[PDB]
Amino acid sequence: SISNLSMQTHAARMRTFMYWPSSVPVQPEQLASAGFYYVGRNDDVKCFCCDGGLRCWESGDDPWVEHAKWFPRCEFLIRMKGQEFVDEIQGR
Ligand SMILES: [Zn+2]
């Protein structure tokens, strides 16, 4: 089931990044697209579906690749990217 139903829509997730720190090299649009919303502390984000949390984002980090690497069984990630994409990331 969905861990945080209130954050299931892209527009609700985007609102959470209003005060996302400027020096973070990963943008709200990319994080929100991958299911992540900002919890309001440093650069901590969580997936609305699996509740997986990620922080300390680096330049070049791809939110979809990170979602597949750390949280492969997420239903949202599998529905958006497909099991084939997840399997490829998991295999590397
Ligand atoms: Zn997830």
Residue numbers in the entry: 260 to 351
Sentences from the paper on this structure:
BTK, a validated target for B-cell malignancies, presents a reactive cysteine (C481) in the ATP binding pocket of the kinase domain that has been co-opted for the development of potent covalent inhibitors, including approved therapeutics such as ibrutinib. As a starting point for our work, we selected an irreversible covalent degrader (referred to throughout this study as BTK-cIAP1-Covalent degrader (BCCov)), from a previously disclosed series built from an Ibrutinib-like BTK warhead fused to a known ligand of the IAP family of E3 ligases. Here, we present a study of an irreversible-covalent degrader (BCCov) of BTK as the target, and cIAP1 as the E3 ligase. We, therefore, set out to expand our understanding of target recruitment within the framework of covalent degraders targeting BTK and co-opting cIAP1.
